[PDB]
Amino acid sequence: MNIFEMLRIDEGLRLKIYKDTEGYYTIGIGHLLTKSPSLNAAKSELDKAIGRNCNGVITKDEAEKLFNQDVDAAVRGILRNAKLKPVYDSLDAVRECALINMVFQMGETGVAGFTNSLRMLQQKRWDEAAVNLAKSRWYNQTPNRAKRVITTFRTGTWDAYKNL
Ligand SMILES: [Cl-]
Numbered sequence: 001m002n003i004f005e006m007l008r009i010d011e012g013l014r015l016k017i018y019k020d021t022e023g024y025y026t027i028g029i030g031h032l033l034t035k036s037p038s039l040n041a042a043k044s045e046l047d048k049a050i051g052r053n054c055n056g057v058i059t060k061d062e063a064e065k066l067f068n069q070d071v072d073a074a075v076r077g078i079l080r081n082a083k084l085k086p087v088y089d090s091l092d093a094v095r096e097c098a099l100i101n102m103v104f105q106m107g108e109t110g111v112a113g114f115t116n117s118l119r120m121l122q123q124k125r126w127d128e129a130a131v132n133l134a135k136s137r138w139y140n141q142t143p144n145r146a147k148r149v150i151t152t153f154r155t156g157t158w159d160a161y162k163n164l
C-alpha cells in the first residue's frame with residue numbers, strides 16, 4: 001500500500017464531472033474543479049486543467065495525470081508549510097500518508113488548523129491524537145473516511161485499508 005492506492009480508495013474514480021460530498025464540482029480522483037455553483041465554471045476549469053475541450057468528460061490517463069499532480073502538490077505544500085513540515089518530518093512513512101490524505105482532502109490551511117492534534121502527533125501520543133482528531137467537523141461529515149485515516153495515525157499500519 002502507498003499513498004496513491006490509499007487515496008484511490010478514499011476518493012474513488014469518476015470520469016465525468018460530479019459533485020463531491022460538500023456539493024462542489026469535482027472529477028477524476030477527487031480533483032476539485034471549483035467551489036462555484038456554475039457547471040459552466042466547472043467546465044471551463046476542467047478544459048483549462050487538461051488542456052483541451054473536454055465537455056465535462058476525461059480519460060483515465062487524464063484522471064491519473066491530474067492525480068499525480070495533486071499528490072505532488074499536496075506534498076510540496078506540506079513541505080513549504082511551517083506548521084506542517086515539522087510534523088511530517090517527525091512521522092514514519094505510513095503515518096506520513098495519513099497526513100498527506102488530510103491535506104489532499106481539506107487543504108494545507110485546513111489541516112494546519114488541527115493545531116492540538118498536530119502537536120500530539122509530533123509527540124507521538126497516538127491514542128490521544130486520535131481522540132482529538134475525532135472532535136472535528138471533518139469526522140462528523142465523513143466519518144468512514146476519517147476513521148480510516150485516524151486509525152492509520154493511531155497504528156502506524158495499513159490495517160484500515162486492508163479488506164477494502
Ligand atoms: Cl490543475
Ligand SMILES: [Cl-]
Nearest residue numbers: 142143144145
Ligand atoms: Cl466517509
Ligand SMILES: [K+]
Nearest residue numbers: 088089090091
Ligand atoms: K519522516
